[PDB]
From a paper:
The HIV-1 envelope (Env) glycoprotein trimer, a trimer of gp120-gp41 heterodimers, is the infectious machinery that targets host cell receptors CD4 and CCR5/CXCR4 to mediate fusion between the viral and host membranes. As the only viral protein on the surface of HIV-1 virions, Env trimer is the sole target of neutralizing antibodies that prevent infection of host cells. The V1V2 epitope on HIV Env is targeted by bNAbs that make quaternary interactions that prevent opening of Env trimer to expose the V3 loop and coreceptor binding site, hence blocking conformational changes leading to fusion of the viral and host cell membranes. A new V1V2 bNAb, BG1, was isolated along with bNAbs targeting non-overlapping sites on Env from an HIV-1 controller who developed elite levels of HIV-1 neutralizing activity.
Numbering used by the authors:
A (entry chain M): 1 to 35, 35A, 36 to 52, 54 to 77, 77A, 77B, 77C, 77D, ...
B (entry chain E): 33 to 141, 152 to 185, 187 to 309, 312 to 321, 321A, 322 to 398, 411 to 505
C (entry chain N): 1 to 30, 30A, 31 to 213
D (entry chain B), E (entry chain A): 518 to 547, 569 to 664
F (entry chain D): 272 to 309, 312 to 321
Write the structure that this text describes.
């Protein structure tokens, strides 16, 4: 069976370049399969970047001259793989990048139309994050208060942060909102909990925020 | 405003498959001898094998899924039995055999036996006491002097291809009927898969000898420029890999023994052709190959592997692994007889980056089950005297090893044994399609009222 | 470039239902070179239908496409749990291949009024130099909800950011976080700070606010 | 010119409409293992008479060219006259037509000869 | 409309002259006991080429409809125009005409194409 | 009830059910098959 395995996640700064690998196991050759690279911006649609069919590289006019797409047939060791290289990165290129494998053998297949084709097999994806900021631990503040309270995890980079309450004791009614990317090019999110107000003075509530990139760990008490 | 318009006989074709038919020309048809090998009813070849080139046509070729092979695979087997059925059935030959190590003066550590056994005649009552000389591979012993019996007796009913019919491979041109055609991929460096740049159509193939052989290809087509490397998938070691020479290689195969053929009457109308005593010197079969062009062949080959594998690496040759004798050794018919040869010293080598000849031992086996089909065997009658056949080596079949050590060394040995690979040697450039002469395309035209 | 306008952006359905997603193109695509994809969150998309109504090897028979002129429709009769997710339509009649805006396919649930809370900035934030006010909208169905920040009975825009949770298997509802951020100095330039929620489940817009110190 | 069998393939259709009588002529071309050469040419006369049958029951009844009262619908491969004949070959074009050929063909058989050949007896019965 | 193969059979001929392209299109349909499936499709091409043979050597040369210069003799089951097409079916009518069909057919082959096709070379020898 | 001619007793008469009827047929003995070699390629499967 066909499995497309691409490279690991990379974080990089603007003005730099980057190449993502795409292991194509199961494909017999890129002479009977074409490789299409498609980008998916955060929480939006997908975008065609380029392809390589009949060993002919391609660009979107939008991405004309900014990108290079190469591929090589299988080594005796390894199956054939394609590589997507991007230059002069901007924060507007931050997205997930997809590998595509489509059989080109039959002219009538309907999957392809003179180079412009649909995408039959896909890979896991490579997250490329473009930002000028460096690693930084989060500043955690309390969202003090049936009533609700929470923790506000602000000014952190890069993702992700894990939020747990009372060292995992409080799990029901816990909403840890996803990260939003601030104007400062920094991440920030909040995690809230709904609990009965009769127990606000009885029990104590503490959220546990951990950030592995900065190796920082803080436990913030949400006093009413 | 566009309409629909029908056009008959448009250059629209689609890919399909059907039954093809042979062409043996007329010259090997005259070989006759009561159905020499294949050619009996075979259609003649075109005197001018018209080859028409098509332009602006990008066609994707696959030799490994090509259907013309499976046909050629089955016909040779059916045509095989079509000889054996009128021929002499040796099923009564399964008998207790009293045999002896053949007469020679010591210096051994045999394989030939003086075999006395009680047989039958054309007259059903009276019987026969006869002796014959057999190779060790056609019999097996059973447990005073040791007694022996044939190897096929507990497997498959044995027949004998009558001496009129020969085994000699006769060039065959496979042809296609109307509404179809055959396409020849002529581009010099072609790996057999993907699209084919040079596409030309013919109604018949070139001369193809259906050589029944293993581990080596003889008399076939030669490649062009670099020696071409063709494999369906090279990442799989299990899939066989085929090569094609630009330079043909000479080999002289001989059975040096001078045989006698004893024709004994099992009839009426039946009879059995046995082996008589060798006349004079006792020698053994063998074939010679030039070591010089051989060493240069491996050098020109190893430079071609370093395009697909590494720029600079190590390449080692070693002898085969295991299997039936039809695989582990080299099988083929030399004029009447089927030789099985030891291939070892050819492949004794280790290559990295930057006047005499060779010789190989050989064995002959008469009883042959080839294509393994049980319930029916065949016996090849012995040919009188010294046998000699000269062959020209146009192709190869190989397999690869396994993970071993990371990016260290790759080893190669003989392989194959499925005769479908034998037919892929000449069929790599061929494939079949079908015509769709009807088509509908818009224009301003419209019919009447 | 062809522009694919998908519709609807979001639909709600329940197991066994027959559901329809339409996708209209800017030009007419006669060759029916349009495909359909399903993307569950995080995992890669799966090709479902090509060339209009061609079924990819292994795609259930429940998926079927119809192509007529400019309009295209993907149809899912007998909707299953495994089917829920987001769907996209793709054309490849002209270079480059282009996708649609997307259609979320959520589960059905009774309309739920949102629980609204307002959170003032922590005193630790004020001596840090920045001030963040959070408005929490919890367990709201459907997910269409607008929030605005009113200071001095005056609108404030461009400085508020939102974040929304993802479908809960137990309640099938959503929660949203609206974070309003501004400078320390601007924070004490007024007394009142208000979060107003407009939602279908509420008879009239519910406003929850706070004065400084209260 | 004589490009032989299929020789005008990768050229476009407006110039490739010249080997029609070439490929139309080479369509018909007129105990075991004698059976191998007998079954093969059976499909030649069947493939020929299928083309002659469709050419007869369509409103054409004559070889190598036809016109129709059937409209070219805008649901069918909408191209200009250069973009049909002069820009696209026969494989390239018939590739694009491969969906809607039957929707053409029912109008070829039924809206023409069930209609206009019915009109021949009605206009000739006087 | 299409009631299938032989769909308008027991209806009269004037309402039943519309399955002609149905039954004309559905006439051709494209070692031991392999012969059982072999002999089946042999008679169809001989029946069909017999129909194109006699259809060609009748004065018609077109499909599904024809008209003749041959008079209908009053001894040939004399019925009025409703009593032919709209009162009697194809089996009921062919019952009545089946005695006299060859008396028609010799006039179809011989008084038309040995006459009026022979007159064409006279009219066009200039 | 279908018969070519019912006045002739000799002609067989055929019937057709509207209701199918169940039957369970068994060979209760547990047989052994002895395959004995009459070959080559021939052999006979006996009863054990």
């Amino acid at each position: 069976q066909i499995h497309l395995v691409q490279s690991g996640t990379e974080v990089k700064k603007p003005g730099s370049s980057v190449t993502v690998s795409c292991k194509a196991y199961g494909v017999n050759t890129f002479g009977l399969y074409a490789v299409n690279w498609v980008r998916q911006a955060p929480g939006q649609s997908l975008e065609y970047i380029g392809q390589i069919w009949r060993w002919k590289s391609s660009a979107s006019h939008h991405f004309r001259g900014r990108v290079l797409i190469s591929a090589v047939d299988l080594t005796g060791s390894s199956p054939p793989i394609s590589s997507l290289e991007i230059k002069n990165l901007t924060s507007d290129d931050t997205a997930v990048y997809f590998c595509t494998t489509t059989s080109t053998y039959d002219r009538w297949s309907g999957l392809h139309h003179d180079g412009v084709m649909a995408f039959s097999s896909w890979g896991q994806g490579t997250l490329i994050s473009v930002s000028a900021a460096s690693t930084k631990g989060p500043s955690v503040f309390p969202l003090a208060p049936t009533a609700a309270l929470g923790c506000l995890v602000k000014d952190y980079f890069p993702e992700p942060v894990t939020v747990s309450w009372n060292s995992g004791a409080l799990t029901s009614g816990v909403h840890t909102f996803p990260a939003v990317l601030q104007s400062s090019g920094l991440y920030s999110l909040s995690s809230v909990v709904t609990v009965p107000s009769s127990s606000l003075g009885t029990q104590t509530y503490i959220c546990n925020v951990n950030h592995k990139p900065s190796n920082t760990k803080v436990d913030k008490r949400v006093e009413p | 405003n566009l309409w629909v318009t029908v056009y008959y006989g448009v250059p629209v074709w689609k890919d399909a498959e059907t039954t093809l038919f042979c062409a043996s020309d007329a010259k090997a048809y005259e070989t006759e001898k009561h159905n020499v090998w294949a050619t009996h009813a075979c259609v003649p070849t075109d005197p001018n094998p018209q080859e028409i080139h098509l332009e602006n046509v990008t066609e994707e070729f696959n030799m490994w899924k090509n259907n013309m092979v499976e046909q050629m695979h089955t016909d040779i087997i059916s045509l095989w039995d079509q000889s054996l059925k009128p021929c002499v059935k040796l099923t009564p030959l399964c008998v207790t055999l009293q045999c002896t190590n053949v007469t020679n003066n010591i210096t051994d550590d045999g394989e030939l036996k003086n075999c006395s056994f009680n047989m039958t005649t054309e007259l059903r009552d009276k019987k026969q006491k006869v002796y014959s000389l057999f190779y060790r591979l056609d019999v097996v012993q059973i447990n005073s002097n040791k007694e022996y019996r044939l190897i096929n007796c507990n497997t498959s009913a044995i027949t004998q291809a009558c001496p009129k019919v020969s085994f000699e491979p006769i060039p065959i041109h496979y042809c296609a009927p109307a509404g179809f055609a055959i396409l020849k991929c002529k581009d010099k460096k072609f790996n057999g898969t993907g699209p084919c740049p040079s596409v030309s159509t013919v109604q018949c193939t070139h001369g193809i000898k259906p050589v029944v052989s293993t581990q080596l290809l003889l008399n076939g087509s030669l490649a062009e420029e670099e020696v071409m490397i063709r494999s369906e998938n090279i990442t799989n070691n299990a899939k066989n890999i085929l090569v094609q020479f630009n330079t043909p290689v000479q080999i002289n195969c001989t059975r040096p023994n001078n045989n006698t053929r004893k024709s004994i009457r099992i009839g009426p109308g039946q009879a059995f052709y046995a082996t008589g005593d060798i006349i004079g010197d006792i020698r053994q079969a063998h074939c010679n190959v030039s070591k010089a062009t051989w060493n240069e062949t491996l050098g020109k080959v190893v430079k071609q592997l370093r395009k697909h594998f590494g720029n600079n690496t190590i390449i080692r040759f070693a002898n085969s692994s295991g299997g039936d004798l039809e695989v582990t050794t080299h099988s083929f018919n030399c004029g009447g007889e089927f030789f099985y040869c030891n291939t070892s010293g050819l492949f004794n080598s280790t290559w990295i980056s930057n006047n005499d000849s060779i010789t190989l031992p050989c064995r002959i086996k008469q009883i042959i089950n080839m294509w393994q089909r049980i319930g029916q065997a065949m016996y090849a009658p012995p040919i009188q005297g010294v046998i000699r056949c000269v062959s020209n080596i146009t192709g190869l079949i190989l397999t690869r090893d396994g993970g071993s050590t990371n990016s260290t060394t790759e080893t190669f040995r003989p392989g194959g044994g499925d005769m479908r690979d034998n037919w892929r040697s000449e069929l790599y450039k061929y494939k079949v399609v079908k015509i769709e002469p009807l088509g509908v395309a818009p224009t301003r035209c419209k019919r009447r009222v | 470039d062809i522009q694919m306008t998908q519709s609807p952006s979001t639909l709600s359905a329940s197991t066994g239902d027959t559901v329809r997603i339409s996708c209209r193109a800017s030009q007419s695509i006669t060759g029916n070179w349009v495909a359909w994809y399903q993307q569950r969150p995080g995992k890669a998309p799966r090709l479902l239908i090509y060339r209009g109504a061609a079924l990819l090897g292994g795609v259930p028979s429940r998926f079927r496409g119809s192509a007529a002129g400019t309009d295209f429709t993907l149809t899912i009769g007998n909707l299953q749990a495994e089917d829920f997710g987001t769907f996209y339509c793709q054309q490849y009649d002209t270079y480059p291949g282009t996708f649609g805006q997307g259609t979320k396919v959520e589960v059905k649930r009774t309309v739920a009024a949102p629980s609204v809370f307002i959170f003032p900035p922590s005193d630790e934030q004020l001596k840090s130099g920045t001030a963040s006010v959070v408005c929490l909208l919890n367990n709201f169905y459907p997910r269409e909800a607008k929030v605005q920040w009113k200071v001095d009975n005056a609108l404030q825009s461009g400085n508020s950011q939102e974040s929304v949770t993802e479908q809960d298997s137990k309640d099938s509802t959503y929660s949203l976080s609206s974070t309003l951020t501004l400078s320390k100095a601007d924070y004490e330039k007024h007394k009142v700070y208000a979060c107003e929620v407009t939602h279908q489940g509420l008879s009239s817009p519910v406003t929850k606010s706070f004065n400084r110190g209260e | 010119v004589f490009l032989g069998f299929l020789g005008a393939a990768g050229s476009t259709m407006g110039a490739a409409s010249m080997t029609l009588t070439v490929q139309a002529r080479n369509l018909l071309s007129g105990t075991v293992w004698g059976i191998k050469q007998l079954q093969a040419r059976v499909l030649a006369v069947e493939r020929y008479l299928r083309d002659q049958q469709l050419l007869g029951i369509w409103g054409c009844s004559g070889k190598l060219i036809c016109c129709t009262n059937v409209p070219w619908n805008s649901s069918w491969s909408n191209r200009n006259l250069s973009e049909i004949w002069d820009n696209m070959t026969w494989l390239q074009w018939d590739k694009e037509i491969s969906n809607y050929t039957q929707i053409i063909y029912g109008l070829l058989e039924e809206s023409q000869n069930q209609q206009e050949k019915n009109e021949q007896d009605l206009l000739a019965l006087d």
